Amino acid sequence: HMSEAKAKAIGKVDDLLELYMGIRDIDLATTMFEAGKDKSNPDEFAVALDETLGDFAFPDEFLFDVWGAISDMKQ
Amino acid sequence: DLSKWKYAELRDTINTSCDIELLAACREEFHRRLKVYHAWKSKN
């Protein structure tokens, strides 16, 4: 089931959102997730984020763990 | 060097510390985060 994978991925991301802001909404987690399933390295992903969510100034350890959550969809 | 702070660390600090500068710097950092959130959330 390749949709349970997308859902787990997003779920693992807004989990990281609650660790960074205490907040948790699926629209944001999905916004980010769908900025990575096309890129190949966390720098290509970092650029996609900066367009929509540039003003967030996301810490590098955070956007890694998110990229880590997206690359898990490979297996 | 405050951007790299974890939320619960900003939270435990604001709720326990005494440092006048630090306390104020954690508030405005904790605020800045939920600020940009409220901004992006408005459009989406």
Residue numbers in the entry:
A (entry chain A): 238 to 312
B (entry chain B): 1053 to 1096
Copy the relevant paper text:
GIPC1 (GAIP interacting protein, C-terminus 1) and its two paralogs GIPC2 and GIPC3 are universal adaptor proteins that bind and regulate vesicular trafficking of many transmembrane proteins. The transmembrane receptor PlexinD1 contains a C-terminal ‘SEA’ motif that constitutes a PBM and interacts with GIPC1.
We determined the crystal structures of the myosin VI-HCBD in complex with the GH2 domain from GIPC1 and GIPC2, respectively. The recurrence of this repeating array argues strongly that this arrangement captures the oligomeric interaction mode between GIPCs and myosin VI that is relevant to function, rather than being a crystal packing artifact. Interface I involves the two loops in the GIPC-GH2 domain, one between helices α1 and α2 and the other between helices α3 and α4. These two loops interact with Arg1084 and Arg1085 in the ‘RRL’ motif on one side of the second helix in the myosin VI-HCBD. The two interfaces in the GIPC2-GH2/HCBD complex structure are highly similar to those in the GIPC1-GH2/HCBD complex. The linear array of the GIPC/myosin VI complex formed through their mutual bivalent binding provides an elegant mechanism for myosin VI oligomerization.
